[PDB]
Amino acid sequence: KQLASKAARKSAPSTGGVKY
């Protein structure tokens, strides 16, 4: 299956073990 863009994205909010 070739994915559409919405289901394809995975995104990271922040690095480090710190809660912002």
Partner 1 sequence: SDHSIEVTFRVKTQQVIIPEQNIRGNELPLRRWQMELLMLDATGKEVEPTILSKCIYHLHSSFKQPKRRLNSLPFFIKETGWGEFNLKIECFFIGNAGKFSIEHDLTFEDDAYAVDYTVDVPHEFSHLNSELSKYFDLP
In the numeric block, which tokens belong to residue 11? 């995104």
**Least distance (Å) from partner 1 to the CB of residue 19?**
6
Q: Smallest distance from the beta carbon of 11 to partner 1, in angstroms?
A: 5
Measured distance CA(20)–CA(17) in Å, rounded = 9
Tokens 């990271």 belong to 12
Query: What is the rounded distance in angstroms from the CA atom of residue 19 to the CA atom of residue 8?
Result: 26
| Residues found near partner 1 in the complex (CB under 8 A) | 1-17, 19
